Design an enzyme around this catalytic site. Structure first.
Site, PDB file in Angstrom:
ATOM      1  N   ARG A 176      -8.905 101.176 -28.868  1.00  0.00           N
ATOM      2  CA  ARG A 176      -7.993 100.357 -29.723  1.00  0.00           C
ATOM      3  C   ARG A 176      -8.538  98.959 -29.923  1.00  0.00           C
ATOM      4  O   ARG A 176      -8.323  98.312 -30.942  1.00  0.00           O
ATOM      5  CB  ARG A 176      -6.528 100.346 -29.237  1.00  0.00           C
ATOM      6  CG  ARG A 176      -5.504  99.823 -30.286  1.00  0.00           C
ATOM      7  CD  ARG A 176      -4.151  99.444 -29.605  1.00  0.00           C
ATOM      8  NE  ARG A 176      -3.811 100.539 -28.692  1.00  0.00           N
ATOM      9  CZ  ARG A 176      -3.253 100.413 -27.488  1.00  0.00           C
ATOM     10  NH1 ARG A 176      -2.909  99.207 -27.048  1.00  0.00           N
ATOM     11  NH2 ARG A 176      -2.989 101.513 -26.758  1.00  0.00           N
TER      12      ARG A 176
ATOM     13  N   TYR B  47      -1.480  88.823 -54.845  1.00  0.00           N
ATOM     14  CA  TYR B  47      -1.292  90.265 -54.960  1.00  0.00           C
ATOM     15  C   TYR B  47       0.147  90.731 -54.687  1.00  0.00           C
ATOM     16  O   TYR B  47       0.741  90.286 -53.721  1.00  0.00           O
ATOM     17  CB  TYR B  47      -2.319  90.890 -54.020  1.00  0.00           C
ATOM     18  CG  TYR B  47      -2.357  92.382 -53.983  1.00  0.00           C
ATOM     19  CD1 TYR B  47      -2.500  93.131 -55.154  1.00  0.00           C
ATOM     20  CD2 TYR B  47      -2.270  93.056 -52.769  1.00  0.00           C
ATOM     21  CE1 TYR B  47      -2.554  94.508 -55.094  1.00  0.00           C
ATOM     22  CE2 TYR B  47      -2.325  94.409 -52.706  1.00  0.00           C
ATOM     23  CZ  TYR B  47      -2.440  95.137 -53.877  1.00  0.00           C
ATOM     24  OH  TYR B  47      -2.468  96.527 -53.817  1.00  0.00           O
TER      25      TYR B  47
ATOM     26  N   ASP C  50      -6.605  85.143 -49.466  1.00  0.00           N
ATOM     27  CA  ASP C  50      -7.130  86.451 -49.770  1.00  0.00           C
ATOM     28  C   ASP C  50      -8.432  86.271 -50.594  1.00  0.00           C
ATOM     29  O   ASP C  50      -8.413  85.991 -51.799  1.00  0.00           O
ATOM     30  CB  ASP C  50      -6.115  87.248 -50.614  1.00  0.00           C
ATOM     31  CG  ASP C  50      -6.521  88.722 -50.803  1.00  0.00           C
ATOM     32  OD1 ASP C  50      -7.716  89.031 -50.928  1.00  0.00           O
ATOM     33  OD2 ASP C  50      -5.602  89.592 -50.884  1.00  0.00           O
TER      34      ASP C  50
ATOM     35  N   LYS D  15     -12.535  97.053 -51.267  1.00  0.00           N
ATOM     36  CA  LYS D  15     -13.058  96.654 -52.572  1.00  0.00           C
ATOM     37  C   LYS D  15     -14.566  96.553 -52.507  1.00  0.00           C
ATOM     38  O   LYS D  15     -15.217  97.582 -52.327  1.00  0.00           O
ATOM     39  CB  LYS D  15     -12.428  95.335 -53.031  1.00  0.00           C
ATOM     40  CG  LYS D  15     -11.086  95.473 -53.747  1.00  0.00           C
ATOM     41  CD  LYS D  15     -10.072  96.250 -52.954  1.00  0.00           C
ATOM     42  CE  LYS D  15      -8.791  96.343 -53.817  1.00  0.00           C
ATOM     43  NZ  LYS D  15      -7.953  97.545 -53.444  1.00  0.00           N
TER      44      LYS D  15
HETATM   45  C1  BLP Z   1       2.879 107.248 -23.898  1.00  0.00           C
HETATM   46  C2  BLP Z   1       1.877 106.475 -24.781  1.00  0.00           C
HETATM   47  N1  BLP Z   1       2.260 106.060 -26.052  1.00  0.00           N
HETATM   48  C3  BLP Z   1       1.445 105.366 -26.884  1.00  0.00           C
HETATM   49  C4  BLP Z   1       0.138 105.030 -26.467  1.00  0.00           C
HETATM   50  C5  BLP Z   1      -0.759 104.237 -27.422  1.00  0.00           C
HETATM   51  O1  BLP Z   1      -1.640 105.116 -28.130  1.00  0.00           O
HETATM   52  P1  BLP Z   1      -3.005 104.526 -28.812  1.00  0.00           P
HETATM   53  O2  BLP Z   1      -3.935 104.309 -27.604  1.00  0.00           O
HETATM   54  O3  BLP Z   1      -3.244 105.714 -29.769  1.00  0.00           O
HETATM   55  O4  BLP Z   1      -2.456 103.182 -29.360  1.00  0.00           O
HETATM   56  C6  BLP Z   1      -0.317 105.471 -25.199  1.00  0.00           C
HETATM   57  C7  BLP Z   1      -1.653 105.047 -24.649  1.00  0.00           C
HETATM   58  N2  BLP Z   1      -2.239 105.576 -23.643  1.00  0.00           N
HETATM   59  N3  BLP Z   1      -3.389 104.853 -23.203  1.00  0.00           N
HETATM   60  C8  BLP Z   1      -3.525 104.661 -21.809  1.00  0.00           C
HETATM   61  O5  BLP Z   1      -2.922 105.102 -20.820  1.00  0.00           O
HETATM   62  C9  BLP Z   1      -4.731 103.767 -21.561  1.00  0.00           C
HETATM   63  N4  BLP Z   1      -4.711 102.367 -22.110  1.00  0.00           N
HETATM   64  C10 BLP Z   1      -3.858 101.340 -21.932  1.00  0.00           C
HETATM   65  O6  BLP Z   1      -2.811 101.566 -21.314  1.00  0.00           O
HETATM   66  C11 BLP Z   1      -4.089 100.005 -22.593  1.00  0.00           C
HETATM   67  C12 BLP Z   1      -5.168  99.972 -23.492  1.00  0.00           C
HETATM   68  C13 BLP Z   1      -5.479  98.829 -24.247  1.00  0.00           C
HETATM   69  C14 BLP Z   1      -4.682  97.698 -24.120  1.00  0.00           C
HETATM   70  C15 BLP Z   1      -3.591  97.706 -23.261  1.00  0.00           C
HETATM   71  C16 BLP Z   1      -3.281  98.840 -22.466  1.00  0.00           C
HETATM   72  N5  BLP Z   1      -2.187  98.698 -21.625  1.00  0.00           N
HETATM   73  O7  BLP Z   1      -1.757  99.638 -20.907  1.00  0.00           O
HETATM   74  O8  BLP Z   1      -1.543  97.600 -21.541  1.00  0.00           O
HETATM   75  C17 BLP Z   1       0.580 106.161 -24.345  1.00  0.00           C
HETATM   76  O9  BLP Z   1       0.163 106.549 -23.095  1.00  0.00           O
HETATM   77  C1  BLP Z   2      -6.602  90.887 -54.069  1.00  0.00           C
HETATM   78  C2  BLP Z   2      -6.168  92.128 -53.262  1.00  0.00           C
HETATM   79  N1  BLP Z   2      -5.896  92.003 -51.904  1.00  0.00           N
HETATM   80  C3  BLP Z   2      -5.497  93.040 -51.127  1.00  0.00           C
HETATM   81  C4  BLP Z   2      -5.340  94.323 -51.696  1.00  0.00           C
HETATM   82  C5  BLP Z   2      -4.879  95.476 -50.799  1.00  0.00           C
HETATM   83  O1  BLP Z   2      -6.001  96.247 -50.356  1.00  0.00           O
HETATM   84  P1  BLP Z   2      -5.780  97.778 -49.825  1.00  0.00           P
HETATM   85  O2  BLP Z   2      -5.547  98.570 -51.126  1.00  0.00           O
HETATM   86  O3  BLP Z   2      -7.126  97.896 -49.078  1.00  0.00           O
HETATM   87  O4  BLP Z   2      -4.462  97.584 -49.030  1.00  0.00           O
HETATM   88  C6  BLP Z   2      -5.651  94.514 -53.065  1.00  0.00           C
HETATM   89  C7  BLP Z   2      -5.394  95.826 -53.758  1.00  0.00           C
HETATM   90  N2  BLP Z   2      -5.856  96.159 -54.902  1.00  0.00           N
HETATM   91  N3  BLP Z   2      -5.290  97.364 -55.420  1.00  0.00           N
HETATM   92  C8  BLP Z   2      -4.910  97.356 -56.782  1.00  0.00           C
HETATM   93  O5  BLP Z   2      -5.076  96.555 -57.713  1.00  0.00           O
HETATM   94  C9  BLP Z   2      -4.220  98.674 -57.098  1.00  0.00           C
HETATM   95  N4  BLP Z   2      -2.942  99.005 -56.377  1.00  0.00           N
HETATM   96  C10 BLP Z   2      -1.764  98.359 -56.286  1.00  0.00           C
HETATM   97  O6  BLP Z   2      -1.699  97.217 -56.757  1.00  0.00           O
HETATM   98  C11 BLP Z   2      -0.611  98.935 -55.503  1.00  0.00           C
HETATM   99  C12 BLP Z   2      -0.913 100.105 -54.787  1.00  0.00           C
HETATM  100  C13 BLP Z   2       0.024 100.733 -53.950  1.00  0.00           C
HETATM  101  C14 BLP Z   2       1.284 100.169 -53.803  1.00  0.00           C
HETATM  102  C15 BLP Z   2       1.606  98.997 -54.476  1.00  0.00           C
HETATM  103  C16 BLP Z   2       0.685  98.367 -55.351  1.00  0.00           C
HETATM  104  N5  BLP Z   2       1.150  97.224 -55.986  1.00  0.00           N
HETATM  105  O7  BLP Z   2       0.426  96.526 -56.743  1.00  0.00           O
HETATM  106  O8  BLP Z   2       2.345  96.807 -55.826  1.00  0.00           O
HETATM  107  C17 BLP Z   2      -6.028  93.395 -53.850  1.00  0.00           C
HETATM  108  O9  BLP Z   2      -6.284  93.561 -55.189  1.00  0.00           O
END
Ligand code: BLP
Ligand code: BLP
Ligand code: BLP
Ligand code: BLP
Lengths: 391, 391, 392, 392
Positions: free
Chosen positions: D55, D108, D182, D207
């Site tokens: 993570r 945006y 941005d 982009k």
């Molecule tokens: C029940 C449950 N629910 C959600 C998550 C988070 O999942 P992700 O690791 O996909 O975010 C987990 C994560 N499991 N991961 C672990 O046991 C190992 N890592 C950690 O706990 C950890 C890792 C990074 C930062 C902080 C921590 N922490 O425990 O504070 C979970 O056990």
């Molecule tokens: C300047 C700038 N900054 C951030 C983002 C978002 O990037 P992401 O698409 O990676 O989240 C963008 C996104 N660019 N995307 C577009 O022009 C096309 N899509 C949309 O605008 C859109 C898409 C899904 C939901 C809502 C919208 N919207 O304009 O409200 C951006 O132009």
């Protein structure tokens, strides 16, 4: 229109399905909804209908359409790397008792495939000088089945007179299959099929991918040769994975902006080297005076960024190390055609050993450069510092 | 300990680098920090030091270590699919004038590679009945270079007496290379190299991947044969992409829990079918009375989930369609070894055409099933509904 | 209709597989409209499984979403870059300044920390409850309680909630509360949260669903009541996961039954052997009598996964801890769990007391958390057994 | 030392490439500790580029992060699943109830909507300013202004901020404000935001950095002042991106110079030709005189990308809009931009007036937004030219 073609090649809606890029369809099994469906797919299994992953998915078909439009072919056969496309395209057309005629400037593994694999299968190979042109008739036997070109040549960069070779081959052995390793031209800077070549082969690994991280060979074939190459390569189980096909298709999109930079930068370095006191000769197809430059100027629409030059001296091992170990920007590695610049050295003895039936004509250390996308003056700076280490 | 081996196979720290799984190192170019470094890599280019992507990266080396530990080999050579591993493992060992001896139950493309590619290279092939055992001496010629087994056989599932065949081959042609397509056993249910077989080949596509979405062939070799297969396959440019190697390595991790379910479910279906009024015979290696079952029981440590049975009737086209087009759970497709259940039909005529020098001994439609991981009673339900459609 | 058949088929409709066995992998940000009319139709159906923009998902996301709704019996699935993202963002989607969050004190540490470090500064308060409080949860409800956050079994210590009693108590006092559970241990399938009157079942799909310790992704399966608000508010935080990860997660489902049966059989066997070992004070496995909430596990769950803990008779000093943990041959030290391999983690009671707000711990020896993977169970017991020999 | 050399080499240290040209792809949730001592060292350096947990990232993330800090001149890079996630979560990381957000009205749309729909319910208010307000921004600052949010050029209408004047004005009244931009149009490189005294430069890496319209990812490059809080608070929301996407983004950098030079050369050529066309009322390209803030573009930027817009002399009715947009051969309708292909989008003045809070629009004809990709520029002009023929 090349830039436009590249952006759009193989991007039919049936492949992209709403996206900009082709889908990535990973599969071995392809499911038939019915016995009728399965019959239809079976008759069209070599014709872009989903049948079995080995024949390909949507993603492979998209790349194949794109290669066929870019190189003007009837079909594109895919392989896990360039060396596989060469070995297998040649195998697809030979039988025991055949003769293969190959440029002595061919990529070394292409030569080795011939001398080590084909020879034990009762197929003989002989070799010709790349500048032989119409005089290649000397080397043609009544059993010559394959004439294998590579223009520019590996390492030393000699450019063939393709029209003269083709005319000669056709007039003496019309049944021969003429093949080219067209990797340096990325297939698009030299339209091999338009010159009467039968199969254009690429290590797509190089410029088509463009990033040094995926391996794939392609063979674009005219209509005369497509079926045989396709079916015999299949019997050898040749294919490439769907994701690599996707990435190669994706590479094409920037191929034009990339090749234009590799051309502009490599020619500038080459012009500089040709005037350098520590340099004997420069082998760059685009450079006036380089072997076959006249053919490049007449037959190609551009240049890529791979070339070589010959030092005035033959470096000894200590000097070799001082030169190559201390570059800041150029890296040592095999392959080329990526975004980064590479350097390799070959001693004349090494080259003499891979020029069958030929004679080397230089005596200094040969340096092969791939000029990537870094600032060209930074790259010149790096080479100039290298020349200081060996004066 | 198989379950433990599978979890850990190839997961050395030099490959995982802090992670649980191997890194995925995508590369063609591999960079040398120095001329000395480049020399060291060059001498060790076939020995797991980074040299060129075609020879492989960390990810390929990890898979190769894992295959070698699981199958008890000196080396593992990688190919883009199973059909490539078969065609290229055989090519690696032949020369013009050789003879190939292949089971007549070999996968059809393995037979075709022989009859269509090898024959034009001055290599002859003949075939034997899978139950021939020690009597295979009949078919051995002084020029027999390859003896190619497949146990259980493709489609009809006959199990060889491997120890009797091997002893016979060694006593008459000690120089022969004995090869097996060991895909059904996923390499681990039948330890081919421990039986004196030289090369164990897999369509890793099947159970090793386990998910019908990546294609890869492997050839694990003993020390006698590893170098030749490895170097000749290389000259053919055979390789597999890094990501596919990763995914195959990843497949191994669940291989044991998967194979145990495919065994338990497929045997239960088979026992049920064998007692079904509409069924003539069932070809399942694990089932008492099936051809070569005695060998399976003696030589294997388990079963997978692919088998076949013969209907009492020979279905006509209308019946074929009514049967196959209306399944809810079984799908029609080629390949097998994934998590899902598949069905295919072969008419006895079709099978008669791919049993060279053999004679078919059934007359009803043959149904090949791959039993995946669905609930086995759901799958029985689906087959029972299918039998209702053809009574 | 059995779970194994469901798992193999979930999400695998032809509009997503296109001829293949698995869904296609559609990588995209832009999705192309062929006409104004097509663009207008896609706009209308942009949160309804029509290709509109990559941030809303592609065919690959829709497949997974369908599979998750099928497996957990939900009206929708919202996807997130990891478990922690699905937790923080599912809570955030339903709160406003002045709300109260009530969370089990056995909740995964980052879930608590989100509440105490992030929510507090946005005018949202949080309190905590003992996981065995059951019907007495009424005592912790406030007029402004918006969310009740469950995790069963609890993180590390594995206490199982009496979910029926808790849900009935909450509904009797604050029927409009949003009840959420982190359902990761059960993989969403060994405990059917939505049949128990919970509104949102959240998983780190990273764990069992992916199954291989190499992709990260969070899911939140929502009833019809709560889906729109979680989805639209999660969208406003830009929450999504990449198409490839969605593919791998769907592909994970395929083997989830065969894997969990193995994790269950093996972990139960290890837990029984630990229960009988002289150096072991207590074993916290939900499947084992004498484990907190075991009775609720037996009644409410259809299985066990491979994660549990046990408490040593000793509280190990630093030297013994190194000695013990540094010398395992098959168990590895790592965070996360839910993969094919076996893992080990130590916690001292002082560490656990510090992440048990408004509650007391019930042990005093070193707590060992095990993930039991797919290795041979006797090899695993031999590894544990050699470990005990190192600290006698 | 030139940008092209930087781009090729950014992030490509041997500890990340391990022999290859590109960084390795390390897929992981669990990262394994070989000993208690190793685990303790990794814990200490968990936000400092040592493998600790997926993570927090793997070698593949660290490579990209290094490359981004190099290219934008930042102390750290925080990664997010998309641009919208980097925007919503960078703002959230710095606010508390009772704060005020000041944002350009050309921001945006989803960035504005996050403010108006999400922040408002957390006791945080937002107001908006005209992008050309420059030094007069002082007029919009409040005692409680925590964040000033810039986007230059603005979304759709392309107005360029006088960033120096804005930054100086904000610092004179609320020196401790967090100024964010941005910076997606410039790809973080044609405008060096951190040299201008901005605290956080945010991109939809989706982009230009990715460049191919097939991966989604957000980045926030932070000065030393702001990095820790953005990083730790983004971590508490579980914000991350998958290793493969990080790889692809780093790989995108490699060709970013050759691509942007093409986008610049081509888009400028199209903009000049549009400026001279009789059916065109105005062209909003930052590189073109008569375009709002052009003067600031000339002074402050080192280049142009391929996105701009122009205003038709007509306000098209629905039939003409379909006629126009439905019949292009090379331009596609799609959202996003910054890829290799050319895109087209129409907006009616009424639509844009609705997303220009506390400000007025300056046009009355139909506004066309173009993304100019890598196709042949004359083919593109022929496509545009046939379009005009459809609506004369
Ligand atoms: C029940 C449950 N629910 C959600 C998550 C988070 O999942 P992700 O690791 O996909 O975010 C987990 C994560 N499991 N991961 C672990 O046991 C190992 N890592 C950690 O706990 C950890 C890792 C990074 C930062 C902080 C921590 N922490 O425990 O504070 C979970 O056990
Ligand atoms: C300047 C700038 N900054 C951030 C983002 C978002 O990037 P992401 O698409 O990676 O989240 C963008 C996104 N660019 N995307 C577009 O022009 C096309 N899509 C949309 O605008 C859109 C898409 C899904 C939901 C809502 C919208 N919207 O304009 O409200 C951006 O132009
Ligand atoms: C013209 C041409 N054609 C085919 C290939 C092979 O493609 P693949 O590398 O994708 O298999 C290539 C590959 N080229 N690689 C290089 O030139 C630098 N490498 C080598 O020369 C090399 C590398 C490893 C082993 C042996 C050699 N060699 O020249 O003998 C090629 O240049
Ligand atoms: C024992 C064995 N050995 C090798 C392979 C080939 O592996 P690959 O499919 O990964 O190349 C296989 C592949 N098997 N696929 C099937 O049995 C079902 N498919 C086929 O029979 C098939 C498919 C497409 C074309 C032709 C055939 N055929 O049998 O001729 C195998 O069963």
């Amino acid at each position: 229109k090349l830039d436009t073609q590249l952006v759009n090649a193989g991007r039919s809606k049936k492949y992209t399905l709403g996206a900009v890029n082709s889908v990535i369809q990973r599969a071995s099994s392809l499911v038939f909804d019915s016995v009728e469906a399965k019959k239809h797919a079976t008759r069209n299994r070599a014709n872009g209908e989903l049948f079995y992953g080995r024949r390909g998915t949507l993603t492979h078909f998209s790349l194949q359409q794109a290669m066929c439009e870019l190189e003007g072919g009837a079909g594109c056969v895919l392989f896990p790397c360039g060396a596989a496309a060469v070995a297998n395209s040649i195998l697809a057309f030979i039988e025991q008792g055949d003769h293969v005629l190959m440029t002595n400037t061919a990529y070394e593994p292409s030569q080795d495939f011939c001398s080590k694999i084909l020879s034990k299968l009762g197929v003989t190979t002989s070799w010709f000088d790349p500048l032989i042109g119409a005089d290649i008739v000397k080397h043609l036997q009544p059993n010559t089945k394959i004439v294998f070109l590579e223009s520019p040549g590996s390492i030393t960069m000699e450019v063939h007179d393709v029209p003269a070779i083709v005319a000669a081959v056709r007039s003496v052995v019309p049944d021969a299959i003429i093949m080219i390793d067209n990797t340096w031209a990325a297939g698009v800077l030299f339209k091999a099929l338009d010159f009467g070549i039968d199969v254009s082969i690429q290590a797509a690994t190089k410029y088509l991918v463009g990033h040094s991280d995926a391996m794939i060979g392609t063979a674009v074939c005219n209509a005369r040769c497509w079926e045989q190459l396709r079916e015999n390569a299949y019997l050898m189980g040749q294919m490439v994975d769907a994701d690599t096909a996707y990435i190669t298709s994706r590479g094409l999109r920037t191929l034009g902006v990339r090749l234009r930079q590799h051309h502009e930068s490599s020619l500038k370095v080459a012009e500089w080297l040709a005037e350098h006191p520590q340099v004997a000769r420069v082998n760059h197809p685009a450079l006036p005076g380089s072997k076959g430059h006249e053919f490049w100027k007449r037959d190609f629409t551009g240049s890529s960024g791979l070339f070589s030059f010959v030092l005035k001296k033959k470096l000894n091992n200590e000097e070799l190390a001082n030169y190559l170990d201390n570059f800041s920007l150029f890296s040592m590695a095999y392959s080329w055609g990526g975004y980064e610049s590479l350097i390799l050295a070959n001693q004349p003895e090494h080259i003499a050993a891979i020029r069958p039936q030929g004679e080397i004509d230089f005596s200094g250390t040969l340096i092969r450069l791939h000029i990537g996308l870094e600032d060209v003056d930074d790259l010149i700076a790096d080479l100039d510092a290298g020349f200081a280490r060996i004066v």
